[PDB]
A paper describes a structure:
Uniquely, γ-herpesvirus UNGs carry a seven or eight residue insertion of variable sequence in the otherwise highly conserved minor-groove DNA binding loop. The [name] leucine loop is a conserved structural feature which is responsible for widening the DNA minor groove and flipping pyrimidines out of the base stack and, in the case of uracil, into the [name] active site for catalysis. kUNG, in common with other known UNGs, comprises a single C-terminal globular domain made up of a four-stranded parallel β-sheet flanked by six α-helices, with an additional left-handed coil of three helices at the N-terminus.
The structure of kUNG in its apo form was solved in two different crystal forms. The disc-shaped structure of the leucine loop extension centred on the side chain of Q212 was not observed in the two unbound kUNG structures. Taken together, the unbound kUNG structures suggest that the leucine loop extension is highly flexible in solution. However, the absence of electron density for the leucine loop insertion in the apo kUNG C2 crystal form, and partial ordering of the leucine loop along with significant crystal contacts in the P21 crystal form indicate that the leucine loop is very likely highly mobile in solution.
Residue numbers in the entry: 21 to 219, 222 to 255
Write the structure that this text describes.
């Protein structure tokens, strides 16, 4: 039943999943519900699809990929976003600092809630949506990959002139799914300081200027821009 897919209806309609894929997602969600009876899993179950409630698919301007959720209780259902009760972790402090140095109307806030981005059409999507407490990458694998890859392809297939910010080796591995004739892809090193630089090669996060370039791209295709400085507590 569509109730237990946890996705907002405008997304269910936009994704147009088959019966097979809806049953496979329901089994995955039911598997996770049973995992919670032995282990703490972030984020909460009713936040797994939190991104799909903050804006509709037609509102998406920029797609930012995460890895897995934070694993210390600060994950909110949005990639990189922080519960106002927890400290801003190294990744987001590094994002704010690139913004502080490049975008005029940005001032670094004292919090890390990025709900204001999500409403404006910034899709903050973890590539794997659950994580066990205190064990990063514990749910990396084929459990979530088919599902988050399906979302990215649906955004590339059905939308036009969006911006994909790919930071790090795992997000950059999703490059083939994006039609770069319809969409802008911008790649960089992961924002967490001293992250890998390739091995096989990508530019540095510091000075990548991805947020201005995203808006330059949307402006040139006559779409509304993202105001990164708008971050409400």
């Amino acid at each position: 039943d569509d109730r237990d897919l946890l996705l907002a209806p405008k997304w269910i309609s936009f994704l147009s999943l088959s019966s097979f894929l809806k049953q496979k997602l329901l089994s995955l969600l039911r598997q996770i519900r049973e995992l919670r009876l032995t282990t703490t899993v972030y984020p909460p179950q009713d936040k797994l699809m939190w991104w799909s409630h903050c804006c509709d698919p037609e509102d998406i301007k920029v797609v930012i990929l995460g890895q897995d959720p934070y694993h210390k209780g600060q994950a909110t259902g949005l990639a990189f976003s922080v519960d106002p009760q927890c400290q801003v972790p190294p990744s987001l402090r590094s994002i704010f600092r690139e913004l502080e140095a490049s975008v005029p109307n940005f001032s670094t806030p004292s919090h890390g809630c990025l709900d204001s981005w999500a409403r404006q059409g910034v899709l903050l999507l973890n590539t794997v949506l659950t994580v066990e407490k205190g064990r990063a990458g514990s749910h990396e694998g084929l459990g979530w990959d088919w599902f988050t890859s399906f979302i990215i392809s649906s955004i590339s297939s059905k939308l036009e002139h969006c911006v994909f910010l790919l930071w790090g080796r795992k997000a950059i591995d999703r490059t083939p799914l994006i039609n770069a004739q319809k969409h802008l892809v911008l790649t960089a090193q992961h924002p967490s300081p001293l992250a890998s630089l390739g091995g096989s090669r990508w530019p540095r996060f510091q000075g990548c200027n991805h947020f201005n370039l995203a808006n330059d791209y949307l402006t040139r295709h006559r779409r509304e821009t993202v105001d990164w400085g708008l971050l409400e507590q």
